[PDB]
Amino acid sequence: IFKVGDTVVYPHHGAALVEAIETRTIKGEQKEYLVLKVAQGDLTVRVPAENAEYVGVRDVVGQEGLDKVFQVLRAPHTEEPTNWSRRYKANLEKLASGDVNKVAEVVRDLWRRDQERGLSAGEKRMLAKARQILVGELALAESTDDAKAETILDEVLAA
DNA sequence: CGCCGTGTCCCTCTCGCTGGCCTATAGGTTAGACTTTAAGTCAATAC
């Protein structure tokens, strides 16, 4: 499941290159602690393989998720609760879930709304963060690189 | 009704120098140009 040199996805930092694994015996138990490095924060995260999936670490998603997110980007007829607070909480929880589909839907909806009439700074921050993580994830999804990943995001949002 | 202990308040000189969250509504304000008017100006003239 976990192999050296694999570009594994760890939430909510997106891509996270593995380096190695260490015994790190604690309580007399050589609990395996595999080490990930994320290029965004330049931090190392050591996680246990036995419950690694419990935290939410996932491998690079294939092309099935790629076409899924494209189709979802072409999913119309979205309505939100009237109050701004409720919809903000909903999309923030959607981002926190780490599900690629949920964050993609949040990003697209917020971007279409912002481009519709322009909103605010907090929504802008949410959109920037979510778009950043999505572009990184897609870049590694097809190893298409961050710049070309941003451009493909920019063409596909056009529909 | 005295003596004692504790808490509180006021005082502690003069002069001088250098520098260190977000959204939606309704209402008031001003700026900007248009139109009017009192105002400043020039040219020729007569005594």
From Swiss-Prot:
InterPro entries: CarD-like/TRCF_RID (IPR003711), CarD-like/TRCF_RID_sf (IPR036101), CarD-like_C (IPR042215), CarD-like_regulator (IPR052531), CarD_C (IPR048792). The keyword Lyase does not apply. Pfam families: CarD_C (PF21095), CarD_TRCF_RID (PF02559). GO terms for biological process: rRNA transcription. Transmembrane segments: none annotated. Keywords: Virulence. It comes from the Bacteria. Belongs to the CarD family. Controls rRNA transcription by binding to the RNA polymerase (RNAP). Required for replication and persistence during infection of mice. PANTHER family: RNA POLYMERASE-BINDING TRANSCRIPTION FACTOR CARD, TRANSCRIPTION FACTOR YDEB-RELATED. This is RNA polymerase-binding transcription factor CarD. It comes from Mycobacterium tuberculosis (strain CDC 1551 / Oshkosh).
